[PDB]
Subunit: 180 residues, 2 copies
């Protein structure tokens, strides 16, 4: 039970998050997002100040959700176990193919962060810090967790670029198998 | 010793490769490239059919050069040694900061490959295949080399996104240290 204002904003942000996951923060236009929301385009600025404010919120939301998902892992798992599980969830064909409910925006957006508003870099840095801390059970595991995040984000990025097929499937497997 | 046609084309491609390394293949405009070449902009189509043909050539050239550099590694090195050396050359602050002579375009471009002309994916696939084959000394090392390439490309991508600083430096180190 809701209302049309709340619903309409949510629809716009939903279209934005989808575009961001797939095409990053630079390419998508207000026209495309509103288009994909099945909304008239004039309505945009009643809900958001700018395209960049919209995409930053989409980015923050998606990342917050990835952190929530990681929070759902069994608290009793070792560092190594949790990292293996995180890797298996991240480095899947479904995630590669944008067929998951809460995709990670990093493969699509990392290359743009340096030229985007500072909020993107700020949220990114904090996201990495929080994730690593949660995946490392001891100070010796900090670097292992960081390299594992690299295997996840990089592995998915490379696999997606290659497109569905044997090579791409092998990239996902190899990246998963190297997680420590 | 050369000529003005050869020189002018080379200047255009030089500006293109630079833009590609830093900002990928989608963002840069003909105007920006010619601008950065200190050329009048009308001259473009005397040398290239389209922006996409230019960027594909820039991409192929940069990747060919990365393969050449890897070819310069001592033939007597083990698989493991060559992978460690490749990683140390790739995962540097200078490479992160676009202060190398022959940078890798993959961090900046991977996210765009799926929506670019097919030549990008084709060249990418071949590049990965050739590199892995050259870094693996036995079939068991194929997956190790692939994961190492992921640590390189992904590590540089994440470090660049974070920008200069301690966290970014740590990403480079952690990624290098995980290479096997």
């Amino acid at each position: 039970m809701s209302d049309k204002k709340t619903q309409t904003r949510a629809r716009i942000l939903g279209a934005a998050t989808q575009a961001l996951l797939e095409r990053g923060a630079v390419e998508p236009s207000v026209g495309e997002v509103m288009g994909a929301a099945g909304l008239t385009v004039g309505g945009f600025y009643a809900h958001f100040q700018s395209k960049d404010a919209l995409m930053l919120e989409a980015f923050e939301q998606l990342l917050g959700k990835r952190r929530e998902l990681l929070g759902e892992l069994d608290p009793g798992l070792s560092g190594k176990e949790r990292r293996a599980l995180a890797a298996a969830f991240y480095l899947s064909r479904k995630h590669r193919d944008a067929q998951v409910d809460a995709g990670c925006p990093l493969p699509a957006t990392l290359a743009e962060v340096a030229r985007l508003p500072e909020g993107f870099r700020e949220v990114l840095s904090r996201h990495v810090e929080i994730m690593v801390t949660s995946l490392a059970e001891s100070p010796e595991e900090t670097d292992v967790a960081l390299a594992d995040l690299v295997l996840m984000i990089g592995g998915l990025a490379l696999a997606r670029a290659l497109g569905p097929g044997e090579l791409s499937d092998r990239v996902l497997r190899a990246a998963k198998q190297a997680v420590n």
